Structure formats: structure tokens, C-alpha cells
Amino acid sequence: GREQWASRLGFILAAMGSAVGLGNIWRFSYVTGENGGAAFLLVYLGFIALIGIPIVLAEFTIGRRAQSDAVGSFEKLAPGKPWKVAGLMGVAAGFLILSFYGVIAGWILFYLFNYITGQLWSAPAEGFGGFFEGFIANPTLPLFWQALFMIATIWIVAIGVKKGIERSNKILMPLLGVLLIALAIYSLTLGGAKEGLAFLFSPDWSALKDPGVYLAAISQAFFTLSLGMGALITYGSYVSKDSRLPGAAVSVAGLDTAFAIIAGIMIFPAVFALGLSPSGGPGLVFVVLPDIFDSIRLGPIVGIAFFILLGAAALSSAVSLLEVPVAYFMRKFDWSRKQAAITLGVIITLLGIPSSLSFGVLGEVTIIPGLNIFDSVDFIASSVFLPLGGMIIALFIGWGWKTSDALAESDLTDSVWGKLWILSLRFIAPIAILIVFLSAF
Numbered sequence: 001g002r003e004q005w006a007s008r009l010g011f012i013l014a015a016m017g018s019a020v021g022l023g024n025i026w027r028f029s030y031v032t033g034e035n036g037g038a039a040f041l042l043v044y045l046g047f048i049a050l051i052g053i054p055i056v057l058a059e060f061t062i063g064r065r066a067q068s069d070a071v072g073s074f075e076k077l078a079p080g081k082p083w084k085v086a087g088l089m090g091v092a093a094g095f096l097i098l099s100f101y102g103v104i105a106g107w108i109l110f111y112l113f114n115y116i117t118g119q120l121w122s123a124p125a126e127g128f129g130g131f132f133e134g135f136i137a138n139p140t141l142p143l144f145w146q147a148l149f150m151i152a153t154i155w156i157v158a159i160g161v162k163k164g165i166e167r168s169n170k171i172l173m174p175l176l177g178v179l180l181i182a183l184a185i186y187s188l189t190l191g192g193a194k195e196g197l198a199f200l201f202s203p204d205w206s207a208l209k210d211p212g213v214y215l216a217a218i219s220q221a222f223f224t225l226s227l228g229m230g231a232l233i234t235y236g237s238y239v240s241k242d243s244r245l246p247g248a249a250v251s252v253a254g255l256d257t258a259f260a261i262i263a264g265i266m267i268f269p270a271v272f273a274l275g276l277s278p279s280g281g282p283g284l285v286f287v288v289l290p291d292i293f294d295s296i297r298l299g300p301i302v303g304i305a306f307f308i309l310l311g312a313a314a315l316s317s318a319v320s321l322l323e324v325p326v327a328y329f330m331r332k333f334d335w336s337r338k339q340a341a342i343t344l345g346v347i348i349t350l351l352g353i354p355s356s357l358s359f360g361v362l363g364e365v366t367i368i369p370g371l372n373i374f375d376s377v378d379f380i381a382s383s384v385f386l387p388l389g390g391m392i393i394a395l396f397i398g399w400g401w402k403t404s405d406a407l408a409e410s411d412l413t414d415s416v417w418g419k420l421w422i423l424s425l426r427f428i429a430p431i432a433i434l435i436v437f438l439s440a441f
């Protein structure tokens, strides 16, 4: 006797809460900026349409049918089969992603603290770039704020699905978009819009010759949709029978893509107006936006709101990440929810400490050749486990299910979409993923 979404539309809300977070504004902005912009944008969008939405629906189908955890969904639906390797990577990918996800979310809480104590209202003596660099170089200051965020994440997973995950404030997410739209409009007036919008919407096709622009595009697409980290199989596993999955998948992926494109329209016109380079790294939004808030008379109020709402959004995504291992360890080892929540939460926190330290004292240490600890874990998680696990998931429903079962449990029977959906999982998605791995590696 396990959990289910109490309210009807609690599923689409929780799935949208998982998808929308730091990946849309933080990671989308610097991965776009260091990949040329528009050409990477057209590739990232095509991957969302032809691969992302089929696998989003695929993960919902596996979860609802099996009614188990990220790994248990494969033991039940296909006993004794090696398909379950897709679920182990997702649990592994959830661990790795949440370790450094909490670091970036700690930067959010630190910036929210400085606008609340009036510290960042005016520009600091060293500039917003120098001020940000001083903070992420500090060894222990970020570990405090990352631990604070993890406590909030541990608290909400421990409370439960019905009492915590489903009980999130549902007005915070529309408010973030309303604030992103208004910051998009304002930044369009800052004078770098012609250069910023050509960067984002006028393609330089030369980038299409680098096999790294596809892997980066497929990493960002899986990352931003919470694909391949066992998150959508778990949330699907709390879903009842009379649930229309296809529209939920299109609604999850469509709303998520709107946030990224509005985040891009906000950031890159602001990047060029400030004279900076769009290849500014993970601190891109963390250096651009405090400068933008300073050019507004009521910017301090804008900054408090922007970091509360984004902070609320990062919290709901991190809650969906920790629930994947939490759900797994409850079944495998009979741990209670609170037991698994604090145990795996404290652990994942300590795994993120080396990632946090790589922006400062550990800045020189490299794991993967050419990449520090943070870039190494992000590469192993985003660029290997998510597309591979995402590829095994597609092959799983494509060649491991009776067609009638797939279309039935997906609510796509006798549909032109159901024929194109099977086409995606059987051929297009696993073929294109394998091609991107081969060219890039």
C-alpha cells in the first residue's frame, strides 16, 4: 500500500515543477552561450520535439504501468531482463546531478540573502563579476548555503508525496514566468538587442560541423526535461489509471521550452549591452542579472523576487531528484521515508562538496582530461548517463513491448501520434542518440 497523487492534476503540476528549475535559466544560458547560440538552439529544439517528448511519454508509461521506483519499474514489467540498467543509471544520474545542483541552488540562497540584507542593492567596489568570483572562491561560505538548501529538500521528501511534493505553492511558478517575461521586455530596451537577438536567432551554421554541439544539445534537452535521471518514472509511478499521459508530456515539455527561450531573450540582449562575452561560464546569469537589477530604480525589489521565485523553482526540481533514490532505497532496504530522506540527503550533500570546492581551492584539479571536478561530474551525469539511459528506455518500449501494450498504456491507441510515437522510440531516438555518441566520442 504505497502512495499516489491525491488531487487529479497534482501529477502534471509536480512533473512541470520537476522540469522547470535551474536548467532553464542557469544551465541553458551558458550552454547556449558557449555553443554559438542560434545553431545550437535549432538543434536543441529539434531534439526536444523528435526525441524529448517521446521519451518523456515513455518514462510516464513505464512508471504508471509498473507502479514502482525508478529501478523497480523494470524488474516488474520485464523480470530477469537487462533492461533495468536504464533505471540504475537514472538513480546514479540523480545522485550525481543533485550533488552539484545543490551547489548552484546555494548560490541562489546566498544572493537572496544579500538583497534581503541590502548588500547588493548598489554595485560592490569590485564589481558584480568580482563579487561573484569572491563568493564561489570562498571554501566554506557556499557549503553553508548548499547545506541549507539540502535541508529544505530533505524536509519535503521526508514529509511525503501527498503532504509535501504535491502541496507546493502553485502560484510561484506562474509568477516566475511573469517575472521572466517582464525582464525579457526590459532587457530588449537596454541597447544590445540587435546583437543579442542575432546571437540567439540568426544561425551561424559552421557550428553544425562540430560533433560537440549535438552532444551538448542532447545533454541540455535531457537535463532540462528531467529525462534519464529516473525522475519521471517515479512521478509517473504515483499516477492512477485514468490519467491522460500524452498531453501531460506535451504540456511538460512545452512549458519547459517556453521558460528557456524567454530566459534567453532576457539574458543575451543583457550580455551584449554590458559588453561581456556570452561564453562567461556557469556564472553567466549570476554576473549578468545583478548588473541588470542595478540599472533599475526598484531593482533591489526585483532581485528579492527573482531569487525567491527561482529559488522556489530550484527547490521543486531538487525535490524530484532526491525522491528517485528515496523511493528506491525504501523498497530495496525497507527504510522508512524519513530514514531514507535524511540518510541519502546528507550523503548527496557531501558528494557535492568537491564540486563546490572546484570553483575555488580545487580549481586546478581535473578528473576527466581538461575538466575540473564540477565539469567532470556534469559531463558523466548529463552527457553519458542521461542519453544512454534515455536510449535504453526508448529501445525498451520500442522492442521490448507488445505494440498494443505500449499504445494502450500510453493512451495513444488508434492515433496518428501513436504511430509516430512508436517510430520515435523504435528507430529515430535510439539511432540518433547512438550517432551523436559516436561522432562526439
Ligand SMILES: CCCCCCCCCO[C@@H]1O[C@H](CO)[C@@H](O)[C@H](O)[C@H]1O
Pocket: 117, 118, 119
Ligand atoms: C537571529 C536573526 C539573524 C538574521 C541574520 C542577520 C544578518 C545581518 C547581516 O547584516 C549585515 O551585517 C554586516 C556586518 O555583520 C554589515 O556589514 C552589513 O552591512 C549588514 O547588511
Ligand SMILES: CCCCCCCCCO[C@@H]1O[C@H](CO)[C@@H](O)[C@H](O)[C@H]1O
Pocket: 138, 140, 141, 144
Ligand atoms: C554560518 C555562516 C558561516 C559563514 C562562514 C564564512 C567564513 C569566512 C571566513 O573569512 C575568512 O577568514 C580568514 C581568516 O582566517 C581571512 O583571511 C579570509 O580573508 C576570510 O575569507
Ligand SMILES: CCCCCCCCCO[C@@H]1O[C@H](CO)[C@@H](O)[C@H](O)[C@H]1O
Pocket: 119, 141
Ligand atoms: C535563515 C538563514 C540565516 C543565516 C545567515 C547566515 C549569515 C552568513 C554570514 O557570512 C558572512 O556573510 C557576509 C555577507 O554580509 C559576508 O560578507 C561574509 O564573507 C560572510 O562571512
Ligand SMILES: CCCCCCCCCO[C@@H]1O[C@H](CO)[C@@H](O)[C@H](O)[C@H]1O
Pocket: 151, 154, 155, 158, 159, 338, 342
Ligand atoms: C538534515 C536533517 C533535517 C531533516 C528534517 C526531517 C523532519 C522529518 C519530519 O517528518 C515527519 O515528522 C513527524 C513528527 O511528528 C512524523 O510524525 C512524521 O511521520 C514524519 O514524516
Ligand SMILES: CCCCCCCCCO[C@@H]1O[C@H](CO)[C@@H](O)[C@H](O)[C@H]1O
Pocket: 181, 182, 185, 186, 189
Ligand atoms: C509588464 C511589462 C513591464 C516591462 C518593463 C519595461 C521597462 C523598460 C523601461 O526602459 C526605460 O524606459 C524609459 C522610457 O519609458 C526610457 O527613457 C529609458 O531609457 C528606458 O531604459
Ligand SMILES: CCCCCCCCCO[C@@H]1O[C@H](CO)[C@@H](O)[C@H](O)[C@H]1O
Pocket: 194, 197, 198, 199, 201, 202, 265
Ligand atoms: C522578441 C522576438 C524577437 C525575434 C528576433 C528574430 C530576428 C533575428 C534576426 O537577427 C538579425 O537581425 C539583424 C537586424 O538588422 C539583421 O540585419 C540580420 O540579418 C538578422 O540575422
Ligand SMILES: CCCCCCCCCO[C@@H]1O[C@H](CO)[C@@H](O)[C@H](O)[C@H]1O
Pocket: 201, 202, 203, 204
Ligand atoms: C521567437 C521567434 C524568432 C523567429 C526566428 C527568427 C529567424 C531569424 C532569421 O535570421 C536569418 O538567418 C539567416 C542565416 O542563415 C540569414 O540568411 C538571414 O539574413 C537572417 O534574417
Ligand SMILES: CCCCCCCCCO[C@@H]1O[C@H](CO)[C@@H](O)[C@H](O)[C@H]1O
Pocket: 179, 182, 183, 186, 295, 296, 297, 298, 302
Ligand atoms: C514585475 C516587473 C519586473 C521588471 C521591471 C522592469 C524595470 C522597469 C525599469 O523602469 C525604469 O528604467 C529606468 C532605467 O533608466 C530607471 O531610471 C527607472 O527608475 C526605472 O523604473
Ligand SMILES: CC(C)[C@H](N)C(=O)O
Pocket: 018, 019, 020, 021, 022, 023, 024, 097, 223, 224, 225, 226, 227, 317, 318, 320, 321
Ligand atoms: C530536475 C532538474 C534537472 C530540472 N530538469 C531542471 O531543468 O533544472
Ligand code: NA
Pocket: 019, 020, 021, 023, 024, 223, 224, 225, 226, 256
Ligand atoms: Na528544465
Ligand code: NA
Pocket: 016, 017, 018, 019, 020, 021, 312, 313, 314, 315, 316, 317, 318
Ligand atoms: Na522546479
